[PDB]
Amino acid sequence: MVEVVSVSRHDRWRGVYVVELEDGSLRIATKNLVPGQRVYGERIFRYNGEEYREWNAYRSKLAAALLKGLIELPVKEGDRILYLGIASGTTASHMSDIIGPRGRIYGVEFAPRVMRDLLTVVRDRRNIFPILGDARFPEKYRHLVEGVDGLYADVAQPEQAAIVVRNARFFLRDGGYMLMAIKARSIDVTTEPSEVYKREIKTLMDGGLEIKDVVHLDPFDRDHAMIYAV
Numbered sequence: 001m002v003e004v005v006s007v008s009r010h011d012r013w014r015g016v017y018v019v020e021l022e023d024g025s026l027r028i029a030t031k032n033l034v035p036g037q038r039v040y041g042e043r044i045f046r047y048n049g050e051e052y053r054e055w056n057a058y059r060s061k062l063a064a065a066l067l068k069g070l071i072e073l074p075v076k077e078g079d080r081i082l083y084l085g086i087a088s089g090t091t092a093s094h095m096s097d098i099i100g101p102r103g104r105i106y107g108v109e110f111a112p113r114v115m116r117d118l119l120t121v122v123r124d125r126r127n128i129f130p131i132l133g134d135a136r137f138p139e140k141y142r143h144l145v146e147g148v149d150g151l152y153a154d155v156a157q158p159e160q161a162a163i164v165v166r167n168a169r170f171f172l173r174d175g176g177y178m179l180m181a182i183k184a185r186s187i188d189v190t191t192e193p194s195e196v197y198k199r200e201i202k203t204l205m206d207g208g209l210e211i212k213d214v215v216h217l218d219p220f221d222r223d224h225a226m227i228y229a230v
C-alpha cells in the first residue's frame, strides 16, 4: 500500500481518480475491480474504505494520452471493447476497472507466450475475454466478438491502420470510438507529419473514421502518439 492524502474522481474522465501523494505530487488511478489483486506491480492505494490501482502513464499508453491532454476518455462503464494487441493486460486491466462487471474487453493477442501471461494476470478478471489470434484476420474470430462500443489498437506493427479498418468493419458500432497507438515523433504531431504517419491517417480516413484528436505521448512514451477517431 502507498499512503495518500486524498483521492477524488476526475471531473471529466469518469472511473479515473486523481490521487495526491505525501509530497503534493499527483497520480491517476482506477478503482480496483478485484480488490486485493495487483496486475503489473502497480502500486495500490486505500481511501474511504476502497482500493485503487495506480494507473502509471509510463507503463500504459492510454493513461499517457489522458495526461497529455486527450480531449475526453471515451472508455465508459459497461462498454464492450475490442482490444487489438492486449499483450499481458496492463492497459486492459484499467479498462476492465472502468467498464465494470457488465462491460467486456475482447483481447486479441497472437503470441502464445504472451497469452499465457495474460491468462495468469487476468484469471480473476472475468470481464476480460482473451482471443488467441492474429488481428490481421478478424474473420477467424468473428464468431467470438460481438458489436463493440470501442476499438483500441496497439499491435506495434507497420500498417496498423489497415488492420484497424478491417476490424472496425466487422465489429465497431455506428459512432464507436477508435483509439490507435501509432509510432510517431513529437514533430509528426506538432510540425508536419512524415510519409508513413500521413498514410496511416489517410487509411483511417479512407476507412470512414474521422480523426477527433491526436496527442503525442512524450515523455511517458517518446516514440508514440495516440490517435482518437469516431
Ligand SMILES: C[S@@+](CC[C@H](N)C(=O)[O-])C[C@H]1O[C@@H](n2cnc3c(N)ncnc32)[C@H](O)[C@@H]1O
Residues within 6 Å of the ligand: 059, 060, 061, 062, 084, 085, 086, 087, 088, 089, 090, 091, 092, 108, 109, 110, 111, 114, 133, 134, 135, 136, 154, 155, 156, 157
Ligand atoms: C505494444 S504490445 C501492447 C501493449 C498493451 N496494449 C498495453 O498497453 O499494455 C503489442 C502486442 O501485440 C501483439 N501483436 C503484434 N502483432 C499482432 C497481430 N497481428 N495480432 C495480434 N497481436 C499482435 C504482440 O505479441 C504484443 O503483445
